[PDB]
Amino acid sequence: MIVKRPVSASLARAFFYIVLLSILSTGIALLTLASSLRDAEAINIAGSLRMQSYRLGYDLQSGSPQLNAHRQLFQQALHSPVLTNLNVWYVPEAVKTRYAHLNANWLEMNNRLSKGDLPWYQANINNYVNQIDLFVLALQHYAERKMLLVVAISLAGGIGIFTLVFFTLRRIRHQVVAPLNQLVTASQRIEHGQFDSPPLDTNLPNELGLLAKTFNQMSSELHKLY
Amino acid sequence: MIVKRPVSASLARAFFYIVLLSILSTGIALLTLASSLRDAEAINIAGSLRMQSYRLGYDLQSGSPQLNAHRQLFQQALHSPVLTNLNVWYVPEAVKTRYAHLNANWLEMNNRLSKGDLPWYQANINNYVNQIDLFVLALQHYAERKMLLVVAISLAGGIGIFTLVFFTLRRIRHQVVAPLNQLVTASQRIEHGQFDSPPLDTNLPNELGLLAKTFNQMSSELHKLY
Numbered sequence: 001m002i003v004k005r006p007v008s009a010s011l012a013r014a015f016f017y018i019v020l021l022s023i024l025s026t027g028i029a030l031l032t033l034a035s036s037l038r039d040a041e042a043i044n045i046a047g048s049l050r051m052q053s054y055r056l057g058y059d060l061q062s063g064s065p066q067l068n069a070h071r072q073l074f075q076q077a078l079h080s081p082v083l084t085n086l087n088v089w090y091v092p093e094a095v096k097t098r099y100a101h102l103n104a105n106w107l108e109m110n111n112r113l114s115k116g117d118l119p120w121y122q123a124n125i126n127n128y129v130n131q132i133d134l135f136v137l138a139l140q141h142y143a144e145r146k147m148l149l150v151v152a153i154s155l156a157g158g159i160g161i162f163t164l165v166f167f168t169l170r171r172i173r174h175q176v177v178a179p180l181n182q183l184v185t186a187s188q189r190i191e192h193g194q195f196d197s198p199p200l201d202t203n204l205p206n207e208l209g210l211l212a213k214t215f216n217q218m219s220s221e222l223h224k225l226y
Numbered sequence: 227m228i229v230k231r232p233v234s235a236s237l238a239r240a241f242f243y244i245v246l247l248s249i250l251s252t253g254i255a256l257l258t259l260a261s262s263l264r265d266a267e268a269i270n271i272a273g274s275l276r277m278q279s280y281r282l283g284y285d286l287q288s289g290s291p292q293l294n295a296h297r298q299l300f301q302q303a304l305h306s307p308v309l310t311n312l313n314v315w316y317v318p319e320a321v322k323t324r325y326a327h328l329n330a331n332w333l334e335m336n337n338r339l340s341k342g343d344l345p346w347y348q349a350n351i352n353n354y355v356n357q358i359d360l361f362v363l364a365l366q367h368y369a370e371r372k373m374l375l376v377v378a379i380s381l382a383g384g385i386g387i388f389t390l391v392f393f394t395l396r397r398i399r400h401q402v403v404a405p406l407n408q409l410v411t412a413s414q415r416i417e418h419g420q421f422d423s424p425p426l427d428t429n430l431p432n433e434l435g436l437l438a439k440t441f442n443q444m445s446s447e448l449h450k451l452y
Contacts, residue, residue: 003410008403015395018244019388026384033377040369043266044362047273051355054280061287062348122288129277136270143266151259154380158252161387162245169241176402177234180433184229187440207406211437214413218444 001213005205007176014168018161025157032150035090039143042082046136049077049102050129056113057121071110078106095142098135105131179208186215195223227439231431233402240394244387251383258376261316265369268308272362275303275328276355282339283347297336304332321368324361331357405434412441421449 052074059067077083087096105128112120182200189197199219200212278300285293303309313322331354338346408426415423425445426438 001414007406008399011395011398011403015391019391022384022387022391026380029380030377033373033380037370037373039266040269040366040373043269044273044366047270047362048276050274051276051280054277054284057284058280058287058351061284125284136273140266140270144263147259147263147266150376151256154252154255154259158248161248165241165245165248169237172237173234177237180233180437184433184436187437188227191440191443207410210410211406211413214417217417218448222444222448 001210003205003207003210007206010171010175010206014164014171018164018168021157021160021164025153025160029150029153029157032146032153036143036146036150038082038085039139039146042086043136043139043143045077045080045082046132046139049074050132050136052077053109053125053129053132056109057125060113060116060118060121067113071113074106075110078102092138092142095135095138098131098138101131102135175204175206176208179204179212183208183211183215186219190219190223193226195219195226227436229431229433229436233432236397236401236432240390240397244390244394247383247386247390251379251386255376255379255383258372258379262369262372262376264308264311265365265372268312269362269365269369271303271306271308272358272365275300276358276362278303279335279351279355279358282335283351286339286342286344286347293339297339300332301336304328318364318368321361321364324357324364327357328361401430401432402434405430405438409434409437409441412445416445416449419452421445421452 052070056067056070056074058064059070064070083099086099109121109124109128112124179201186197186200189195199216202209202212202216204212278296282293282296282300284290285296290296309325312325335347335350335354338350405427412423412426415421425442428435428438428442430438
């Protein structure tokens with residue numbers, strides 16, 4: 001008699017899949033959250049561009065001396081680190097393309113502003129800011145996507161951990177714990193000469209199967225010299 | 227001889243704490259993410275109020291016929307579901323209070339607008355929109371907090387699962403798997419009359435300790451009639 005399916009290997013496998021699942025789900029979730037940390041900041045700055053744009057029209061009409069300073073503030077906001085860090089592989093085409101339209105469009109706006117072309121501004125500002133609005137919408141959706149993905153994985157892993165634990169403990173109980181109790185009871189019984197006790201099930205392919213057999217064999221005999 | 231620390235109870239406890247930790251960390255993470263699903267939307271709408279406010283000044287100066295429609299659009303945005311659902315226990319005082327200032331302030335703005343008081347608007351718009359700006363900042367920070375909290379728990383649970391698994395498998399190996407292999411080897415050896423083999427360690431408080439003793443006892447004797 002050999003042991004065909006050592007317990008050592010079964011557990012290795014079981015606990016490994018519990019682990020791997022834990023690392024995989026935590027790895028993706030944490031990557032996604034790392035990439036999402038500045039989403040709120042991103043949406044705020046991109047939106048501000050809409051206020052800044054209408055503010056520029058207001059400064060034009062009123063002859064404000066802050067026009068040029070407001071014109072630089074817009075430039076600086078548009079090319080702020082958080083928005084330039086959107087040109088990067090894991091960000092979708094829609095966000096990156098809408099962003100590129102806002103840079104082109106600005107070049108025409110800023111220019112027209114330096115020629116103080118107010119009729120132009122009045123005709124174009126609705127369309128101009130709309131384009132900004134769609135950019136911020138795209139960022140809003142992308143933030144929502146990433147967060148949903150995290151909810152999927154949090155909920156998949158926490159379900160998959162509950163599953164794997166359940167079946168692993170279940171298998172341990174039926175193939176190790178229950179049979180060990182039978183062995184112990186049988187050991188305790190023969191030790192006080194109880195001998196008409198039904199023999200152990202030997203059909204486990206692990207160590208408990210081999211011990212059952214040894215036990216039944218050592219016990220059928222030593223019961224009979226007796 | 228009794229079994230002082232049944233394996234059944236040890237595992238119950240071990241796998242339970244693996245589970246509980248999984249549920250607790252997933253429960254908090256999923257609550258936090260549920261409450262965070264509309265954070266991006268919230269920040270976008272709140273920001274839009276800044277554009278809308280400057281747009282109203284622009285319509286005042288230009289005599290636009292959209293002033294009143296733009297005035298309702300602001301009202302509707304300010305009292306949109308996503309912003310009114312901020313008056314709720316799990317949202318901090320700072321967000322809820324800044325929101326309340328924006329409702330008061332609007333009442334003065336909207337009124338002054340219906341008296342087309344343009345000098346008033348020019349004096350107050352900087353301060354007015356600033357107050358909106360601080361509200362959106364507060365929302366931005368709160369979104370960032372919640373997300374950091376989720377990162378803490380994702381990373382605490384995924385570490386705590388790796389810890390508990392590690393010690394549980396470790397304990398199983400030393401108290402169940404290693405001793406079972408000794409039993410099997412010992413069983414296999416006496417079955418082919420090897421008998422000067424060193425006796426099993428009996429110092430485990432579980433079933434393996436009792437079996438070791440039974441084995442050593444049944445083996446010291448049956449070795450000697452021989």
